[PDB]
Amino acid sequence: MSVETIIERIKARVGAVDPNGPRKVLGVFQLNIKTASGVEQWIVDLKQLKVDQGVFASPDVTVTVGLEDMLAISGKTLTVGDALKQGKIELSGDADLAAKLAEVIHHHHHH
Ligand SMILES: CCCCCCCCCCCCCCCC(=O)O
Ligand SMILES: CCCCCCCCCCCCCCCC(=O)O
Structure with missing residues (x-):
């Protein structure tokens, strides 16, 4: 249940994205997870x-x-929306590109 389990869900989703939901997009995201030995x-x-x-x-x-x-x-257990307000996720560059992504995250549980 470490960073591996977190990304494991993304790598699977990204390569499973359906053309019915999102659309041809462009850009890059730099995710930085904190650790006991750094980031x-x-x-x-x-x-x-x-x-x-x-x-x-x-x-x-x-x-x-x-x-x-x-x-x-x-x-x-929690939603990006909540953490967003609390200030758990920092925005650097284009809050739009990042915010847009969270949109797909903020949804029903079990996924
Ligand atoms: C840096 C943010 C943390 C990791 C981001 C998890 C990425 C989840 C899957 C990305 C695709 C979801 C959005 C659909 C449109 C697209 O980006 O191609
Ligand atoms: C500033 C808006 C960006 C939103 C990024 C949410 C915080 C990082 C990603 C959360 C965990 C994603 C891992 C599972 C894939 C998903 O369901 O989104």
């Missing part, structure tokens, strides 16, 4: 819908979230 970098592209480790040469958006914060969402 884990991640690159989430929207052009081809994929995910990678580390940091991109220059992401269009930079997301900053803590471990507990992520586990809360991916754990289906």
Whole structure:
């Protein structure tokens, strides 16, 4: 139930995205999860819908979230909306590109 379990859900979703929901998008996301030994970098592209480790040469958006914060969402226990207000996720670059994504996250549980 670590960062691996959190991303495991994304990598599966990104490669499972349906043309009925979203649409041909473009850009990149830089997810940063806090840790006891530092922070884990991640690159989430929207052009081809994929995910990678580390940091991109220059992401269009930079997301900053803590471990507990992520586990809360991916754990289906909490919603991005709540954490959003609390200030769990930081916005760097284009709050739109990031906010738009959360839209797909804020939904019914069990997923
Ligand atoms: C940096 C934010 C944390 C990780 C983001 C989880 C990504 C979930 C799946 C991405 C695709 C969902 C949006 C559909 C349109 C698209 O982006 O192609
Ligand atoms: C600023 C808006 C961006 C919203 C990003 C939500 C915080 C990071 C991603 C949350 C956990 C995502 C892991 C599972 C995939 C999903 O269901 O979204």
